[PDB]
Amino acid sequence: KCNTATCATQRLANFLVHSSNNFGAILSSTNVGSNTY
């Protein structure tokens, strides 16, 4: 998981290179949905 740590670099970088995640995030709802449900 890694909430607040060096991992941030990996996660962010992944979201930067995978712009698609911006849209797919609504299909998976793992980063936007899981945040609550």
Swiss-Prot record:
It is found in: Secreted. It comes from the Eukaryota. The modification Tyrosine amide is found at residue 37. Disulfide bonds join 2-7. Changing residue 15 to A/D/S: Promotes formation of fibrillar aggregates. Amyloid fibrils are degraded by insulin-degrading enzyme IDE. Amylin/IAPP is a glucoregulatory peptide hormone that plays an important role in the regulation of energy homeostasis. Selectively inhibits insulin-stimulated glucose utilization and glycogen deposition in muscle, while not affecting adipocyte glucose metabolism. IAPP function is mediated by the CALCR-RAMPs (AMYRs) receptor complexes. Amylin can also bind CALCR receptor in the absence of RAMPs, although it is more selective for AMYRs. IAPP is the peptide subunit of amyloid found in pancreatic islets of type 2 diabetic patients and in insulinomas. Belongs to the calcitonin family. Can form homodimers. Interacts with IDE and INS. Interaction with INS inhibits homodimerization and fibril formation. The mature protein is largely unstructured in the absence of a cognate ligand, and has a strong tendency to form fibrillar aggregates. Homodimerization may be the first step of amyloid formation. This is Islet amyloid polypeptide. The lineage of its organism: Eukaryota, Metazoa, Chordata, Craniata, Vertebrata. The chain holds residues 34 to 70 of 89 of the full protein.
